[PDB]
Amino acid sequence: NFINLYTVKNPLKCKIVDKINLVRPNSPNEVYHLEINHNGLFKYLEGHTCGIIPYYNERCARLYSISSSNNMENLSVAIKIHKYETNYGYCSGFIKNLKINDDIYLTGAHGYFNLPNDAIQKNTNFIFIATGTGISPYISFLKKLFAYDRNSNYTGYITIYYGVYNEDSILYLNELEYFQKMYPNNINIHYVFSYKQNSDATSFYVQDEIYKRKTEFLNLFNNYKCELYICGHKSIRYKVMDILKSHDQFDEKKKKRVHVEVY
Amino acid sequence: NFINLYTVKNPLKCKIVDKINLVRPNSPNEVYHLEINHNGLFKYLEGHTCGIIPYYNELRCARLYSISSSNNMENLSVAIKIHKYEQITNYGYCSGFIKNLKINDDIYLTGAHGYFNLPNDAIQKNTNFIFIATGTGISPYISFLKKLFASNYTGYITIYYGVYNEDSILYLNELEYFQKMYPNNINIHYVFSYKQNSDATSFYVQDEIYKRKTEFLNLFNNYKCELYICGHKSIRYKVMDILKSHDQFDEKKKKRVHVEVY
Numbered sequence: 001n002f003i004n005l006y007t008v009k010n011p012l013k014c015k016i017v018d019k020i021n022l023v024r025p026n027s028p029n030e031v032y033h034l035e036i037n038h039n040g041l042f043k044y045l046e047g048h049t050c051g052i053i054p055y056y057n058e059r060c061a062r063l064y065s066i067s068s069s070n071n072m073e074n075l076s077v078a079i080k081i082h083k084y085e086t087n088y089g090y091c092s093g094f095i096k097n098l099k100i101n102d103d104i105y106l107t108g109a110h111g112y113f114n115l116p117n118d119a120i121q122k123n124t125n126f127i128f129i130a131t132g133t134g135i136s137p138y139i140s141f142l143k144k145l146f147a148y149d150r151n152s153n154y155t156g157y158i159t160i161y162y163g164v165y166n167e168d169s170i171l172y173l174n175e176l177e178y179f180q181k182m183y184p185n186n187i188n189i190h191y192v193f194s195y196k197q198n199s200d201a202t203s204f205y206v207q208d209e210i211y212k213r214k215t216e217f218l219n220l221f222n223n224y225k226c227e228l229y230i231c232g233h234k235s236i237r238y239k240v241m242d243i244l245k246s247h248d249q250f251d252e253k254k255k256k257r258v259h260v261e262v263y
Numbered sequence: 264n265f266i267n268l269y270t271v272k273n274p275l276k277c278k279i280v281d282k283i284n285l286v287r288p289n290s291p292n293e294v295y296h297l298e299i300n301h302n303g304l305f306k307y308l309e310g311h312t313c314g315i316i317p318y319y320n321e322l323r324c325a326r327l328y329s330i331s332s333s334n335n336m337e338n339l340s341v342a343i344k345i346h347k348y349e350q351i352t353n354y355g356y357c358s359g360f361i362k363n364l365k366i367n368d369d370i371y372l373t374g375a376h377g378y379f380n381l382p383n384d385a386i387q388k389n390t391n392f393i394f395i396a397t398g399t400g401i402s403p404y405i406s407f408l409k410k411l412f413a414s415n416y417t418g419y420i421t422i423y424y425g426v427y428n429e430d431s432i433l434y435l436n437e438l439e440y441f442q443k444m445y446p447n448n449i450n451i452h453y454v455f456s457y458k459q460n461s462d463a464t465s466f467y468v469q470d471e472i473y474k475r476k477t478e479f480l481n482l483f484n485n486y487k488c489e490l491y492i493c494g495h496k497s498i499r500y501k502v503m504d505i506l507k508s509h510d511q512f513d514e515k516k517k518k519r520v521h522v523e524v525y
């Protein structure tokens with residue numbers, strides 16, 4: 001299958017085709033969308049990550065959610081540039097200085113944060129919870145479910161809770177705006193702005209929006225039997241579980257409907 | 264201090280000066296000794312490790328390697344086992360990199376790691392040592408021996424060294440040299456496991472210490488030896504178990520135990 005087709009011991013040589021800032025001028029973040037030519041060789045399902053090996057020339061690979069769908073020729077990835085005290089993270093500094101037409105080395109696929117195979121036929125309902133770059137897997141989910149290029153056979157309902165610093169920090173804004181305008185009876189997006197660079201504070205703002213919208217959120221999960229996806233900083237996970245645990249019956253059978261990709 | 268002078272964020276570009284197979288025909292793994300030109304820029308004490316960043320090219324991910332050279336040498340050195348695994352053979356990440364490395368290739372180092380150092384009073388105080396090694400665990404001790412013997416250090420060194428077989432003793436030449444040059448001050452006990460199982464190898468080292476438990480404990484306790492343990496993780500507790508049994512083992516003794524296992 002797709003998992004570990006390429007590893008650090010046989011990474012895939014790829015090429016940077018494009019590199020676009022994803023944020024607008026009032027964002028405190030530097031985040032780049034990378035479009036990557038893999039010559040059709042990198043196999044993935046929506047929700048998978050790829051690994052990038054910084055500075056490689058023919059763990060150690062940093063994982064990035066793939067934001068493109070399968071039937072796109074190139075793959076895409078959204079990468080936040082981490083800084084401290086000037087000084088960059090290991091992969092962050094590499095991605096910062098990367099240029100179009102540069103080589104990049106990939107491993108993968110990695111992860112199990114995928115759609116159910118039933119999804120488009122079963123018209124599965126979804127809750128997608130995201131913070132920061134945690135939106136990327138959902139971008140690929142949407143591109144798949146609504147056959148991006150109204151080619152959609154999918155008539156399920158999707159609710160997105162997306163927490164970012166501010167409006168200018170919303171990643172893939174144009175794509176989110178597109179799906180919402182094209183499919184206004186299938187998609188509901190709730191932006192939460194924290195105005196805090198601290199991820200643990202952002203996740204509390206998301207938990208707090210969900211609490212404010214608990215009747216929506218909890219009927220979606222307990223009544224309409226949505227699949228619940230959580231992606232982003234590790235602090236949201238237990239905060240979303242607390243909401244489920246404190247407000248209604250919550251057993252291992254309901255836990256089967258909770259999918260988590262945190263970091 | 265010299266710790267983290269170079270990191271993965273800013274590695275030191277260095278050159279391979281030599282690459283020498285340290286093992287003999289009956290050893291089932293390659294082990295390469297690397298002489299590395301760092302332009303005098305890499306700073307370290309004996310016992311320190313350097314990190315190598317496999318496949319790096321200038322625009323937990325670096326593997327650590329004990330430096331086997333002393334400060335006073337111009338180039339640094341390192342001994343690197345080439346790890347194989349089956350399922351057609353594959354190589355470890357850094358192992359495959361080191362395997363293919365040529366003389367004059369670039370190599371990027373990260374910058375003194377660890378606390379596996381000699382006490383700085385060692386030469387003036389004539390400190391006695393117990394060095395326990397398996398496999399590549401010998402490397403820091405080769406650097407120790409190079410430092411201690413400058414020479415008027417008259418301490419007493421005991422070395423326990425477990426390897427697969429005689430063709431697998433790393434730095435055999437250096438060990439034999441030091442043992443023969445200072446025959447009253449260096450005592451080496453070798454153990455061959457004859458099994459390609461790292462856990463077996465450390466069992467046999469423990470077994471050789473058990474045979475000599477009285478000598479061993481009387482060296483550590485009465486001659487106040489600094490005890491060093493280096494190599495595969497499995498030796499750690501097997502040696503600790505010997506310091507537990509037939510011994511009170513207080514915490515002024517634990518000041519005298521140094522561990523670098525992996």
Ligand SMILES: Cc1cc2nc3c(=O)[nH]c(=O)nc-3n(C[C@H](O)[C@H](O)[C@H](O)COP(=O)(O)OP(=O)(O)OC[C@H]3O[C@@H](n4cnc5c(N)ncnc54)[C@H](O)[C@@H]3O)c2cc1C
Nearest residue numbers: 062063064065078079080082083084089090091092133263
């Ligand atoms: C499953 C999964 C999916 C992921 N998906 C994405 C994604 O889609 N997009 C994305 O951008 N990231 C994603 N990540 C995280 C991504 O891998 C990060 O870029 C990586 O984890 C951090 O990268 P780095 O090498 O640049 O930072 P590192 O060098 O590994 O450091 C980690 C953090 O510590 C900080 N740090 C490093 N040194 C210091 C210092 N000494 N003092 C203070 N702070 C320091 C860095 O700034 C950084 O924030 C994902 C992670 C996982 C596990």
Ligand SMILES: Cc1cc2nc3c(=O)[nH]c(=O)nc-3n(C[C@H](O)[C@H](O)[C@H](O)COP(=O)(O)OP(=O)(O)OC[C@H]3O[C@@H](n4cnc5c(N)ncnc54)[C@H](O)[C@@H]3O)c2cc1C
Nearest residue numbers: 326327328329342343344346347348355356357358399525
């Ligand atoms: C403080 C310290 C000092 C050290 N000093 C030395 C030293 O002086 N000399 C030295 O040689 N080493 C030393 N090491 C260990 C050194 O870092 C090794 O080269 C390294 O840890 C093994 O690296 P690798 O990249 O080749 O293998 P990796 O790929 O990182 O390690 C995996 C191990 O499992 C095996 N493996 C990998 N993938 C698989 C798989 N899919 N299935 C089954 N098996 C697999 C590999 O063969 C290898 O043995 C030290 C380590 C530490 C922490």
